Subunit: 363 residues, 3 copies
């Protein structure tokens, strides 16, 4: 296997785009939603935890998530990237690029949780939680879905992380919750998340091919459809649209299309977008932790719908040989259930260890 320079270029740019989603995307998003007096502290926690994730990833994260091991975890043969030749190739790109791309996904997942909870959690407690949750929840789930683990071995479909990122973070944030003064800033963060999401979704193809092109177009379509779906629901239920509704709709479509983008047709993207936008509005209506309502509900919806719209007859790329829509749907549901329980349990353990060691609630 030789590296393709076009894929190397595409993937390094896509990685920078995903990093852009956390720094400063998610920080600005939450920054405009939380109380003004808590903004500085939250920005500090998001930046420091981002740094922490980057370091844990290179030290042992990548190795445990992507090394060969068992159904749940990799190995410790790639500690500090030891044994990875600089010219080593993963797919059609240099492995070092795969390390950075995969690391960027861990970063946004953690940013999603930290940005919302920073307001109520002690600084030392969040650092402890991140270490526990990244190591025991993000890493094994990434291994199970993208590292040849349990879910992948059963043929679960999740192109860019409906489970690994969205559902995983939503449950962790919701467990935390249980235990806007600047809308232009919310809009700015939403816009940065949107632009960076093209690297997130299209880069998930691992090459600048027709699947990356499909994921790109589906991202544009689902996001637009979800903005319109949310806004229509808002107009129907509240009498008028709002800026927060439009931004929430964009995020709902981005989240919903995440697991499906590289497997569905544009018709499927439009349908998923509208359904996600409406489900997202329903989610928040029920339930800054409300954000987890969108990531959680839309992630679930997206993961289920991937099991329908991947079908050739519906314009998708087609299910694997010998797999019926019925069989695929069951696999999607099982993957969702496993992600929820795994993340929830680990998050509980993380919060408890922090509370027992330094105390959870901000002093």
């Amino acid at each position: 296997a030789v590296a393709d320079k076009a894929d190397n270029a595409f993937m390094m740019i896509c990685t920078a785009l995903v990093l852009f989603m956390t720094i400063p995307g998610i920080a600005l998003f939450y920054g405009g939603l939380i109380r003004g007096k808590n903004v500085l502290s939250m920005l500090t926690q998001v930046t420091v935890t981002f740094a922490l994730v980057c370091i844990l990833w290179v030290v042992y994260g990548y190795s445990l998530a992507f090394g060969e091991g068992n159904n749940f975890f990799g190995n410790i043969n790639w500690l500090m990237l030891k044994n990875i030749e600089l010219t080593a190739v993963m797919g059609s790109i240099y492995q070092y690029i795969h390390v950075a791309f995969q690391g960027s996904f861990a970063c946004i997942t953690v940013g999603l949780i930290v940005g919302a909870l920073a307001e109520r959690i002690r600084f030392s407690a969040v650092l402890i939680f991140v270490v526990v949750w990244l190591t025991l929840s993000y890493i094994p789930i990434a291994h199970m879905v993208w590292g040849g683990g349990l879910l992948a071995s059963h043929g679960a479909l999740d192109f860019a992380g409906g489970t690994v990122v969205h559902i995983n973070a939503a449950i962790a944030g919701l467990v935390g919750a249980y235990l806007p003064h600047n809308l232009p800033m919310v809009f700015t963060g939403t816009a940065i998340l949107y632009i960076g999401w093209f690297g997130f979704n299209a880069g998930s193809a691992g090459t600048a091919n027709e699947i990356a092109a499909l994921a790109f177009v589906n991202t544009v379509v689902a996001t637009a459809a979800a903005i319109l779906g949310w806004i229509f629901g808002e107009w129907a239920l509240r009498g008028k649209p709002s800026l927060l509704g439009a931004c929430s709709g964009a995020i709902a479509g981005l989240v919903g299309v995440t697991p499906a983008c590289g497997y569905i047709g544009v018709g499927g993207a439009l349908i998923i977008g509208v359904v996600a936008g409406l489900a997202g509005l329903w989610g928040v209506t029920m339930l800054p932790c409300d954000v987890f309502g969108v990531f959680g509900v839309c992630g679930i919806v997206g993961c289920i719908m991937t099991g329908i719209f991947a079908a050739s007859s519906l314009g998708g790329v087609g299910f694997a040989e010998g797999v019926t829509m019925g069989h695929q749907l069951l696999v999607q549901l099982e993957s969702i259930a496993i992600t929820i329980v795994w993340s929830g349990v680990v998050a509980f353990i993380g919060y408890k260890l922090a509370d027992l060691t330094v105390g959870l609630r901000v002093p």
Copy 2:
């Protein structure tokens, strides 16, 4: 024809850069120019109309603009991208990428109009206007210039949209007009527009070749020359430069070089930049709708100057075989005249239909 992965990568990144120009570029630009009390509403209208354009584009826009038809419109053979194989190639990239790239241009064109008029127009009225104007003005003009229609068939030169985007939007906005509290925000929007404009201009080559490189360098040069031209005029006429003047100068150069970037030499880019910056200052001095003065005047200037500076003797790539500078200038003037009348008439019809159905002026 086979897709080149390097071109696929370049074009997907360029598309994200153009999308970045609208979300959040143009929104922040207008956001700092309009009254504070109208900012939220404008951001909502820009986001919702952006979503609408994305959907109309995939449903029928792309097909009618880029399908084979007549001198004015394409066809309905590509509705919802039907009949476009995922592996289909357009130029040296997958057609799906061409769909997204072309769609991003429709988005910024509409954002230019909506951002300025949002303050004075009813929400439902702007949605009606967008549908009418995108369908009857943007689509046919795009077809005429870039889709093998009337203007292209007469050899009109417009590399990145001096007519299709700038003049087209300026006239529509000016028809609307007829019927700064945050300068750091204006600066931020200008900066995002500038960075995204490299995807807009260089991506217009459709490949990462020497023409993309030329357009890139010419973009840097014309923008810089226009900032200096505007600022000098401002210093001479008002006694000092201002932040708004510097930002306006950047936009004047970006607009002026848009139709010429892939056809002229760096000397030509410098001259076009200075002339555009000064013409832009003159334009605003005469005439947030003042913004259309820059897009309109600089677009016209840029389109005319392309007919001069494309000449080999002036460092350009050269006019087509058998075409004199005199003949090319006439074609540029005719293209400008047609764009102005076409856009103006359609815009009038759009505003009138909205006013007759829901009422134009914000209630």
Copy 3:
């Protein structure tokens, strides 16, 4: 030599990313640090001087920095890019792209100086200073390090500009100094600088190869390590972290890894990051001109450490044949000393000429 389209694509995107560091990165960074009443003026000076640098670069800058000449300067054979065929290749990319990429480095270097001093300097005086300093300091130092001049001919290692950019600007700013109201804005500028820095560092490979991948990963690692190093020092010395500390730490790591990114291993990047973060904190503690403390101290630290960590035995790419670590360290020290003296003297001359002609201090 033929151009590789993958490298052309990568390098044009990397150039836009470096331009993004100045417009609006550095402007927002300083914008949140300086007094509110001076923000507009500073943004104007950064924009106008950016334009000036772009023009001087194309007119004669590129030719004098990268043309063949002597140990200190190039030639005037490439004035306005004359004699450079559009299809001319430099390395594996079109020369026009090399012109734009190199120009973007000149821009950020000047932005670093102008953003800090704008508050205290007369507008006309800064323009005079920029012309003198860019021409007599940036150009010759760029030629000496990257244009086959004195330092390169002695085998100095500086992958992305620890000397040419960081030390060069820090000394110029400090000579100037001798002669935060919005922390969310500082954070936003820091984030943009960070994202753009991937184009700055990885693009310095000139191709989307394994060295670009290495520089990319090392950038992620050193930045994260420096954020943690600074924050730990801050917690130890002040009792708690702060947002400004976290942002300063990121910049310290970015600066420190700049000369080393394409030559060291990830272990080396982590060590350089931590040392840079701590040295940066020490620097500011001693000494908006405090920013030069970070760029100056971290640039020196990074340049020295490159001479250690490039060693094969420490995970680096290895020193050139026949070069010991001892010999390389001496070359790094000599390069640093020469950069400091050269920049300091030229800066003094620049400020003096401005003061004698129009007066330095803002009227």
